[PDB]
Design a protein around this ligand. Sequence first.
Ligand code: SF4
Ligand SMILES: [Zn+2]
Ligand SMILES: [Zn+2]
Lengths: 169, 434, 380, 464
Amino acid sequence: IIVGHNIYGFELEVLLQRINVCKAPHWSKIGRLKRSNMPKGERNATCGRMICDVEISAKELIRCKSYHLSELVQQILKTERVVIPMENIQNMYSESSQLLYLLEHTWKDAKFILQIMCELNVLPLALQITNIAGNIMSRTLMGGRSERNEFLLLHAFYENNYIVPDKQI
Amino acid sequence: YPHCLQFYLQPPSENISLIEFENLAIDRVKLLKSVENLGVSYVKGTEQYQSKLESELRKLKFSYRENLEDEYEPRRRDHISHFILRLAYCQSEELRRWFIQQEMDLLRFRFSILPKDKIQDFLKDSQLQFEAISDEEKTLREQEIVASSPSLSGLKLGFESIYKIPFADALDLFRGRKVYLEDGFAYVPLKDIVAIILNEFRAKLSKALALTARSLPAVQSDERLQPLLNHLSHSYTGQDYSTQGNVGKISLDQIDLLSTKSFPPCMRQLHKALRENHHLRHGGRMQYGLFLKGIGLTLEQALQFWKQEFIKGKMDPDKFDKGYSYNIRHSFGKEGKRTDYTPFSCLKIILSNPPSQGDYHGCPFRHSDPELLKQKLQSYKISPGGISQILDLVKGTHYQVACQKYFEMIHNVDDCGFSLNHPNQFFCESQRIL
Amino acid sequence: VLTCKIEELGSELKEHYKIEAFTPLLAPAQEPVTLLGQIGCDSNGKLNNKSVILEGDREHSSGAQIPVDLSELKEYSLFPGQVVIMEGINTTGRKLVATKLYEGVPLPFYQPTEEDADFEQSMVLVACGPYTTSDSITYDPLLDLIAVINHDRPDVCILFGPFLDAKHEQVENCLLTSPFEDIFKQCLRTIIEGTRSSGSHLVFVPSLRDVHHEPVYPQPPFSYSDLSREDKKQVQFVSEPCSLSINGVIFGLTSTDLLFHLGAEEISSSSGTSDRFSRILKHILTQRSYYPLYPPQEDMAIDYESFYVYAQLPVTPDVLIIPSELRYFVKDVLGCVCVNPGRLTKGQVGGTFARLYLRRPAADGAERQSPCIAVQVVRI
Amino acid sequence: HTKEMVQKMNLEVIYGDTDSIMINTNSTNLEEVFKLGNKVKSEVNKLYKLLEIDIDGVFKSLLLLKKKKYAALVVEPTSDGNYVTKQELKGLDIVRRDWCDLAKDTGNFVIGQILSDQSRDTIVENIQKRLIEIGENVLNGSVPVSQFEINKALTKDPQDYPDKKSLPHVHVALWINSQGGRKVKAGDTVSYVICQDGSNLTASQRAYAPEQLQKQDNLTIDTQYYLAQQIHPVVARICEPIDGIDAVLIATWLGLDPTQFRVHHYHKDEENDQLTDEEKYRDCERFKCPCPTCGTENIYDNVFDGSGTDMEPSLYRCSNIDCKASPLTFTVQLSNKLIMDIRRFIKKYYDGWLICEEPTCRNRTRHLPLQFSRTGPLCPACMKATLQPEYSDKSLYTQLCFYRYIFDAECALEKLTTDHEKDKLKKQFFTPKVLQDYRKLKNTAEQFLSRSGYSEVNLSKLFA
Ligand code: SF4
Ligand SMILES: [Zn+2]
Ligand SMILES: [Zn+2]
């Protein structure tokens, strides 16, 4: 399981694009299946590894004014979270101590993300919801209530000798 | 006399102006609201009931002088009004029951007016089949019809006509062996016939009302028609006369006596609470202050009244001018309307702002418990039979009829001669009697 | 109405240019994207290079708005309300750096039948009001025009309003001693009776400055009932805007000053050596409406539910008549002969009118063969 | 069905949307509230079987603005009767950051008193008392100058703003750029105040830097601006929902505003849930037409001019005492002027100006956004509000009904109380010639009302 914030709407695509821009060796190690060519999608890129987005799971589990990482820590974790504007990032490269602040900030966000997941019990809850509905765990973590219950009805009709509708597109 | 009866079918396909659309709906609500009051205050077969209902029908222009067949003004008004008013009352089940109940009393009354010869034509123009018999056949089967008739005493077979109908349509009568049957037909007198007609009309109307609520989303988008669908009985009176403005001359030294003789119970309780505690909460202040404005007080008189009453509460004179003169001055003047400048109506008092502990506003007949209301009426020097009548009326949710009875028994008259829907109207009619 | 406009134009543009799919405006994407939307300003003022925004469609972007950065765009021409397809970079999802602007595509021309090629040479006269000087009620230019019509005896005369100007000093100060309706009928009778011997058909197009008429666009035809049986064959009342087939030739008639409105709120990359009027006319022809600008001018009433059904171009016209306050001109743009004769009266001095010859040549040839063979803008 | 049951047991439903119901109990004992709450549980669960309601929480105080927009005191129950009240706000953020220190200081006080535990009469008295003093202090100049400073951040170079002239912070930044040394750029913040110059220019164009305020003598702080445009919006957004308090009332506490302020007041805001001719036509503009002879402006607001014995037709004699010309003679000019006055209101309606409903936003735009909320178009400046027409179709319809009403002698005669007075003046002024003149002016307004504007109602579409 890989946990991050705004993974499904930013970081995953940026990472995959930067990988093929500089022609990094063996991109497929991001997944679990050896593949040659990558698509231009995101969900198919990391096959074998389930990605948990704290932003998506927070909306389903708690009510907040905003679901930014700064606001998420303020409500759930009850702790301030300083920000570095993207304009200042260049100016922190001129001194050793300043660039260690940028590294220190990066590390703290990773531990903050790991903390929000454990307090909300996202991982135990995902297993229980999946077992009741009877679908794939990577799909319930992505989001979408309708997709989960669709599998619940699908299982019910199959065991009672029914013809189910074909998938629409 | 005329053919004003109709089974309300085939909606109108005309088009009308917005002014007529609003006027027809308001008039129909007024008529149906007064039919219920006449039914509660009387019985369906008295001279007073018939006379008052007919006079009201004349006044609201729902049956009057003739015109060229189709654009008969009263018939057209009646049709369009009924179909307009269906939309307002289709929503709730309690509203549906009320509309169904009140729309049948009017049909009963109108059927009671028809001459003895037009009934056959009306029936034939009605659903499919009703037929009468001649005197020869009526005398041929006179004895059998009399024997088949119910346990009604005697052989009094008057001149009333007898109708032959298919037996199935008379089901509720023939399964109990209460009508004469001969070759798939039943011979029925007038009373059971009007009962059958009313039952059929009720069934059709219930079906139409149930169907109408289904297709309601298609009118709710109209901004012009939002005051109709939602608020035809909510907080604005159907038609009100006792309003802001007007003329009057009331002395400040007389309010104590008019409180005992002229004020309705709500204003009486507010006045007593104010004179005792030298203070009133926000709701009581608004209600009683607007009532006092309605009866003819002026700005200077109102300021003097409230100041002289609030000084005895051990405050600083200047605090009144700093904090409470503003609201009184605002009340008598310009915009900021719909709750601040128009005196409260009976419906608004009854269905809004319920009082709490320490609040003396509201309607006594509605918010007071029956025992507490009984003790209140006893202190009002009311005969025990009057209490028995009033508490019986109150139990049936008819608060304003109970207040009407209170008016009648306080002023020692048989009938008030009016329908009460506003406290200021209660004061005005009391002053008119003197 | 606005949504359907955007979707229809976008669907046709997608079919023509064979693009793969449109991307939502708010969705970040590191690769270049193709967006569909309409142009607008971010304030209540005049549009400029710094205040451009793009508002998406309901199907794809659900009506979202994003700023547009035009620093890296070489050539462009933009006005508010233009349905456009952009290609650019949008990495953050809150701002688009436009890099390519797809060009618009016009409607196919009218397809002549066999009958339309058998018509003979015709002459058409075109004039636009006001028909009186700003300091008088005499209506002298009208009489001069009637004299010219009687002398030349053309085949068709198209007259644009206003006939009773709403901006005239005597009208707006209410010094007239007669009802507006009566004065209008007086003018109409003077025109109809004075050109009876000519035998030329008369077409009257209303204006939004006509005081007696409804000030809402599009306008219905004029009302006139005092016509004998003879006059009903020569006088015809049309709406505004109108598409008129004259001997198998398509005329686009509009009285609104669209050129003066579009040109006042249009930004472009090149300003040294470029033709403004040709560019505005290209916008008009490729936008497929008689009024592409949204929101309209400050004093311009438009009813959109009727604008949707009564004010669309059916085909690309053969001749487009566009009277305006700008200088008179005749230009061939995209196979269409656009003619601006100006107003018949300009201030206290006289104006101009226009005359055209029409004759459709043989069917075969080098594709386009303009039925209009000669135009002349002449002084009154 | 549930709403009907609750109001029958003397309880008030103040909100409900498909998964939630808010009920006002009029109770002060918490032990009774839960007992009262469990009674609703059984009442609904009596008719049905499987659907069950459940307690969610208790508020000790509420300020209900809109869905997900309120200030409340949540009850956190401790052991055996006691509880702790927690301040909780949502949807009460202002998007703009250009408020002075005096406005933000006042705003926190009002919200602070609301979330107290005192009764309503105590809250209003405390709020009214403070607002009275603030108005007094501003007029006497007892407020420090630094309280009036306003700061706004530029997003573009000052010479790239289309609105330029109407933006106070751009106007100051232009003066900084051209007058002295350092130059402002995008991202910089500008400080300014609104002063009086004696030049009658708009409040946007009377913005000066704080430095020039004490350095120059002929200018002084505009107290009218801050009282009406800075202080009033902040207070009114919170105190308007309170019963017995109206936007005109706040203005009265603050100065001599009310009559002018109520002209700037709204029309739709009073819609909480027929009307008389005096109250129905009160916001309509009077008909004005100068006399062709003397030039004096004439005001027409009713068929009759005056009261009692000396009441006469309004169109009988000119308002000027020295003028002996009868307006009834000049009927054609009156009808022409009517037409000019109606195209004005029709064009005004079709302009399409939308204005935001939030007192602190008040965004004005002519462009209709394609993003709609549940109520209407969604404001693009503050993304949580709805735009509303500045001139609605009901205002245009009521205006045309007013012109038809001031020239309707047919209906103005049956409105007279006694049948004797109606006869006395019908034979005195209302000759058959006079009656025909009013019919021509009445038919002018009727042509515009005839088939357009949907004063018509189509019953075929309504029922079928
Ligand atoms: S019925 Fe009306 S008048 Fe009588 S006590 Fe109640 S509110 Fe007052
Ligand atoms: Zn005069
Ligand atoms: Zn807004």
